[PDB]
């Protein structure tokens, strides 16, 4: 067997393997008649038609199953002789497969080092002490009243402080940007604006008079063919709708689903929101400050295999969002995926080390109250707790999440906890 | 959300869950803004463009993520309140997703029955008593030179007992069909017979003729829209080759792959091949006798969920080979999938119950010896066993196969063991 273990750097090593033509071919014939025998579909029956011709002439489909086995078939043997152990999964980077010659592929595996964390006390824990008094309730209620100010058909030009119901669609330098356009787009004021140029074209003209704008995408834009390329957008200026407050009437209150219809019912729906919004935002802030603190305490050098696995999931899933086209993945900037990925894998090493060596058990009290809180998001809390209590694989997942939280907590209580007073507004204004 | 359970058939409990239009759309906007903020692909940036219009107008490309979440989201609560749970996995039978509508999907499954094996004494174990003597080697050797004789170019009429390397293609009923054609298809004699009309047509014509044979596919054939339809096969008699025996010449010894050239090397390579195939034959004979013993003696009630799992693996794998056409999967007569699946699920329950209740542990010496036996095939056997010993993920699968064979053995030694003498030829005659 043709194998070549190269070293890239430290953790990473590039084991380049080449499988011979007939070594592939015989394996195709083998797995053809195998899967044919078990699934009862031997073309006709189990005594005719040599899989030799089936493979060579029209066995490009089965070649996925075959090469799928052969990558791990040559791997499993080669790693025995050389003592090669990947960190979870090896990054199989293939160049090309010539049909009827060989199959060369670069097996870029990483090794998992023993992680250690330092600066546990040096980490700043934020407790954003928000206590949502009627100042915060009615302050945010006024923010709601003024920001959700009703729509009204403006007579004139578009401006910064207007909504406009339009659409944008066309091409970027002659290419159809797959799903990157909104037929009947609502441009709403008050919130942030899009790329300088786009919204500028919109607010450069009056309603009714429809035209195309040509704006180049930023190099900060998250697709290689769209960024730097000029983009023509067929702007159909239909309806310019200004925001203005008539009053906080039951007509407005009704649009939040308030059956009671009165503003006092609006406060009550807002209390039901404020319950899970306040709890999850506080928990998000202390969790965020913790995770940021852990990584910033120890920006460790993680195995790239875990990053690559995260990147495969994130590339396929992103490209699924961009029309489902695989090719789109390969033109999203890698470092926008490696953002969440790096943090996921670093925290995976750190918190894993914590629950392992600090011997953190699924603390029955901690996971009890955790389950009670997520159950109080459902209609019947008590019975959700009671059913989870029986269920094995639920209590596996509840063990893990209680231990993620408990691993954060082990270093959280060890860290510089700072109980800092803020308001409901500041809590979510500093987020999105 | 709305849930409603209905008994399909006994264990089959159709939990029909109506997910309301808004229950979908809100979860769509959720998974949109989530994936946007974590991957930082918010179109432009994390402060613009409501996910409302993104969902409603072109949010088809997130319905995998959304419905993928909702399948567990609605189900997890539904099973809590009412008491209701699948054996392994629930079969989600969904409606066609019309947008701006309640997605009602039939969440079917079967509950797990107490599996028991019976008629252990009635199960007759076949121990086919064979040896690799020069009698069996010369028997197979004579069959080898007498069956696998060299080919000569024939100019004349084709028989059933000729070779003919033809390129056939055409159309079934008038419609072109994928996969069912082969350029330089070798109709070799000696081995079994093809479908009636086809090979009868080939042998009904003399070398040089380019014609067509319109033959009807059997109603027993492995696909619906092909079976029962006549099929015009444009047979171009390309190569016609007569089957003739010269001798077991050094020309032939080389052609078999034996570089050694002298017949002593043909015998050596035959000893190595006969070694591993004798092992795999005896293994397959006692294994298949025992497996079909347990299954055909105990046609137990198996939860359809396990069948769906196996069938999804088998339909992916098969339809990938049938041009990658996932629609054609559902078109294959399902009993060909359920053939293997029935065996896998019944064995999985029976042998599972054996190793569980009888406390069958992966015996270190037994799994070690099993690995010696299979590693014999590999490049360095005792180092294979040695390296495997470290890797738990692989030793998990080695524990699987060890306990499957050990569970077979726990009933094998209990079953009516009958030693039945055979030759090497008769051992594989039916199996091949």
Curated annotation (Swiss-Prot), chains A, B:
Ranges for domain PPIase FKBP-type: 161-246
Molecular-function annotations in GO: identical protein binding; peptidyl-prolyl cis-trans isomerase activity; protein folding chaperone; ribosome binding
Knockout-associated phenotype: Non-essential; synthetic lethality is seen in a triple tig-dnaK-dnaJ disruption, although this depends on temperature (triple disruptions grow slowly at 20 and 34 degrees Celsius but not at all at 43 degrees) and strain background.
Region listing for Dispensable for chaperone activity, although its removal significantly decreases antiaggregation activity, in residue ranges: 148-251
Transmembrane domains' residue ranges: none
EC number: 5.2.1.8
Compartment(s) where it occurs, according to its Swiss-Prot or TrEMBL record: Cytoplasm
Keywords: ADP-ribosylation, Cell cycle, Cell division, Chaperone, Cytoplasm, Isomerase, Rotamase
Cellular component aspect of the GO annotation: cytosol; membrane
Biological process according to GO: 'de novo' cotranslational protein folding; cell division; chaperone-mediated protein folding; protein transport; protein unfolding; response to heat; stress response to copper ion
Sequence segments annotated as region (Ribosome-binding): 1-112
Residues with the ADP-ribosylarginine modification: 45
UniProt xrefs under InterPro entries: PPIase_dom_sf, PPIase_FKBP_dom, Trig_fac, Trigger_fac_C, Trigger_fac_C_sf, Trigger_fac_ribosome-bd_bac, Trigger_fac_ribosome-bd_sf, Trigger_fact/SurA_dom_sf
Catalytic activity: [protein]-peptidylproline (omega=180) = [protein]-peptidylproline (omega=0)
Catalytic EC class: isomerase
Pfam families for the chain: FKBP_C, Trigger_C, Trigger_N
Family as reported in the entry's similarity comment: Belongs to the FKBP-type PPIase family. Tig subfamily.
HAMAP family registered for this protein in UniProt: Trigger_factor_Tig (MF_00303)
Function: Involved in protein export. Acts as a chaperone by maintaining the newly synthesized secretory and non-secretory proteins in an open conformation. Binds to 3 regions of unfolded substrate PhoA, preferring aromatic and hydrophobic residues, keeping it stretched out and unable to form aggregates. Binds to nascent polypeptide chains via ribosomal protein L23. Functions as a peptidyl-prolyl cis-trans isomerase in vitro, this activity is dispensible in vivo for chaperone activity.
Subunit structure comment from the entry: Homodimer and monomer. In vivo most of the ribosomes are in complex with monomeric TF; binding as a dimer has also been suggested. Uncomplexed TF is in a monomer-dimer equilibrium with approximately two thirds of TF existing in a dimeric state; binding to substrate PhoA induces monomerization, 3 TF monomers bind somewhat independently to a single substrate molecule. TF and SRP can simultaneously bind to ribosomes; TF binding is abolished when SRP is bound to FtsY in the presence of a non-hydrolyzable GTP analog. Contacts ribosomal proteins L23 and L29.
NCBIfam families: tig (TIGR00115)
PANTHER family attached to this UniProt entry: TRIGGER FACTOR CHAPERONE AND PEPTIDYL-PROLYL CIS/TRANS ISOMERASE (PTHR30560), TRIGGER FACTOR-LIKE PROTEIN TIG, CHLOROPLASTIC (PTHR30560:SF3)
Protein name per its UniProtKB record: Trigger factor
Species per Swiss-Prot/TrEMBL record: Escherichia coli (strain K12)
Gene label: tig
